């Protein structure tokens, strides 16, 4: 435990700067662990998933489905 009124972490200009528009968005009530807890996301949707196959045994949520090939597209 310590008294940290405001934490980094590790936050460089850019993820500061994130943070800021973040924290702006939330009209100053975003606190560096809240822009953290989300981090905590970002990191993790940094990688995997958006490289198509990964979220399970197929990728149809990003497809290519060119479909070049319908007479009927909508029924």
């Known amino acids: 435990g310590r008294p940290g009124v405001f ?7 850019e993820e ?3 943070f800021k ?3 702006e ?8 662990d809240d ?3 989300d981090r905590e996301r970002e990191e993790e949707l940094l990688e995997r998933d958006e490289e198509e196959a990964i979220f399970g045994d197929g ?3 990003k497809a290519t489905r060119r ?5 009927r597209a909508k029924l």
């Open 35 to 37: 822009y953290l807890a």
């Open 67 to 71: 479909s070049r090939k319908a007479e």
């Open 59 to 61: 990728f149809g949520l």
């Open 16 to 18: 500061y700067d994130e």
């Open 7 to 13: 934490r980094t972490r590790g936050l460089t200009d």
């Open 21 to 23: 528009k973040r924290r």
């Open 25 to 32: 968005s939330r009209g100053g009530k975003y606190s560096i």
